[PDB]
Structures are given as structure tokens and as C-alpha cells.
């Protein structure tokens, strides 16, 4: 496809929850930037995939696609935490845990060539291996 890729990173599994029920999520400042960014150049010609971890779970939990763009002026506290400033769409698409010794293969150029399993918020995944990632998390049992 055309698609862009990027993990979601997460110290909260609550607004985890949150947003498979409301469809929507926020990032930190630069983490919305960069994700605003990628989806208004891509003026529809493709989708922006989202892969979510909770941090230190051990695994992935599901994927989503953005479906809007970043509204910076909402309503403040609907978190867990504060911090948070603004928020987008999304459409959740699997919601399945995946074990991190199913991804680790799959290493970053773009990252030193970590794993894929390593990355912090909002690092971008190269297509080919966003390709092999989604396969995985939707063949898995
Ligand atoms: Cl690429």
C-alpha cells in the first residue's frame, strides 16, 4: 500500500481501554505533531496505522487506524493523567494480545536496527516492516 506506521507507547493500560470505547487517543506535543504531520501529507492516499504497547507488558495490544486530525483545544482530565493536550479519531481494527518474542525478530533500520519491540512513542516503522508486523499481529492465536 501507501500506508505509514507507527508504535503507540503507553504507561496506561486504563486509557488503553478508553479508547477502544470512545475511538480516540492523544500523544505528548511532539508525539502529535509527528502524527499530524504524517496524516494531513498523506491527504487520503493512504492509511496511518497505529501499534499499541503498554510499557512494560510484554506485549502488543491491538491496532488502529487514525481517522482524524489533531484537535489541540478539547476537554482537559478525561485521562488517566493531565498531560495530555488535545486529541484525534481512531478506528481500532484487532484488539488481540501478541507476545513480544513473536515481533523481536523484526528489527528498525531507521531505529540502529533495534527491535521493533524496543521502540519508544510514536517511532515510525518502515513500510516492509510494518507489512511483517501487521501480519503477524493478525495471524496470531
Ligand atoms: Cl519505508
Known amino acids: 500500500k501507501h500506508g505509514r506506521v507507527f508504535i503507540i507507547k503507553s504507561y496506561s493500560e486504563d486509557d488503553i481501554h478508553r479508547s477502544i470505547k470512545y475511538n480516540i487517543w492523544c500523544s505528548?506535543?511532539?508525539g502529535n505533531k509527528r502524527l499530524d504531520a504524517?496524516?494531513?501529507?498523506?491527504?487520503?492516499?493512504?492509511?496511518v496505522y497505529l501499534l499499541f504497547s503498554?510499557?512494560?507488558?510484554?506485549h502488543f495490544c491491538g491496532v488502529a487506524e487514525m481517522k482524524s486530525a489533531v484537535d489541540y483545544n478539547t476537554?482537559?482530565?478525561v485521562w488517566s493523567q493531565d498531560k495530555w493536550k488535545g486529541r484525534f479519531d481512531v478506528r481500532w481494527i484487532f484488539v488481540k494480545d501478541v507476545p513480544n518474542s513473536?515481533?523481536?525478530h523484526?528489527?528498525?533500520?531507521n531505529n540502529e536496527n533495534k527491535p521493533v519491540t524496543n521502540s519508544r512513542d510514536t517511532?515510525?516503522?518502515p513500510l516492509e516492516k510494518a507489512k511483517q508486523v501487521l501480519k503477524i499481529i493478525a495471524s496470531y492465536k
Not at 38 to 47: E, L, Q, V
Not at 106 to 109: A, F, H, M
Open 38 to 47: 504524517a496524516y494531513r501529507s498523506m491527504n487520503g492516499k493512504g492509511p
Open 28 to 30: 505528548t506535543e511532539h
Open 102 to 104: 513473536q515481533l523481536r
Open 54 to 58: 503498554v510499557n512494560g507488558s510484554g
Open 75 to 77: 476537554c482537559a482530565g
Open 106 to 109: 523484526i528489527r528498525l533500520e
Open 123 to 125: 517511532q515510525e516503522v
